[PDB]
Amino acid sequence: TLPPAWQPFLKDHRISTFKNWPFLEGCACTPERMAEAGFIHCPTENEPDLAQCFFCFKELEGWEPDDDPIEEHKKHSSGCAFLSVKKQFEELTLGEFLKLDRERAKNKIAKETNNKKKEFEETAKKVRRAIEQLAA
Template sequence: MAAAAAAALTEAWRLYLVPTRVATFCNWPFTEGCSCTPDRMAAAGFVHCPIENGPDVAQCFFCLKELEGWEPDDDPLEEHKKHSAGCAFVALQKDPASLTLQEFLKLDKERMKNALVCTCQCLARKRNLTEQSTGSEELCSEPLGKSGRMLYKVSSCYRVRVDRMVQRSLYTELDM
């Protein structure tokens, strides 16, 4: 029954479940006798996303912080706190499965903000590579508008793209 319920969730929401994150740690270089086992990595919010020259790359599904260069005695939760102190998932004081719907949606709103910021930064880098001399790809750290949405000014073109992404998101903005 629990597996069927989990399958009904969106892919992003399934990542709140530890078993889903554990399943990403195929060919993880650290197993028994290490502090950074797949179970402990997943419990700290990480998913395994290896690259050709980095078999130990892990990324927090929530704040999107990537860490690599793991040592067998590294504590995943402590490393996560050290490198991404503002991660709301790390600061969470309860199991995500026990959150109320309102708490979950508020938390997921933060995850979506992180994804939008990451997308904006990626777009800015791409634009910077193609238009290096214009200087118009400035990222500012203030949200646009009073809604609290994390829409960062990259340029008017990118702001429109991000606005469309928000309009297409799976949930509407909540007043929390």
Template sequence: MERRPALPEVWKLYCSSARAATFRNWPFTEGCACTPERMAAAGFVHCPNENSPDVAQCVFCLKELEGWEPDDDPLEEHKKHSADCAFLSLQKGPASLTVQEFLKLDKMRMGKSLKKEISQKVTKVEDKAKIQRCSIMNLA
């Protein structure tokens, strides 16, 4: 029996229900505009850290937003802070996408992901270079 290759793990998060499930301990639920369901519908997953319990990140453009207020509209906030998000430009959920649209969306997400990773590595190298420069200057 032939085994199929596993699908990328991130593709699970292309489904709104999987994104909504990430909003455990989300502070805004009933009576709020930014409920887990609305956050997920706008493309967000919940990725809290110890300093920011309300951090949400778009799965597609990787934009992180925090400091949510109960009356914030997730879709409007997403548009305001990441107007070039491919998910927003499609104006339909992944279940309604053609294969071509899905692959284009994934390609754009991967591009954003690579740029973010490269930027973080460049910053790390620059920080180490700065420390080395200081060490060299102290030898003189």
């Protein structure tokens, strides 16, 4: 029994988020493997095999059966500190756990800063196009 904010640190919570995940028995990227690797399932109508690292917030889609979630995570987000954690959840100390949650909080904020940047640039493109068109 942990608060909602912290559940994603629990493997079994992460596994539970996989609802209608297509890759099951026989595949390398099963819910169990995705979850061990830190991923949560975050599907859209648009992008339905979308998954996200709960810790560094990197999102990945286009999953294929033979994809090893751990190697995919290393490839696309080499610096994610969850990948460094070798001890089991319950073997962590509260100090270690609190250190991790702080790094996660920083990761969230960095990601939101990076999204707001991308949104601002997209709006700036449209504005630029609109002005060019009215100049022409």
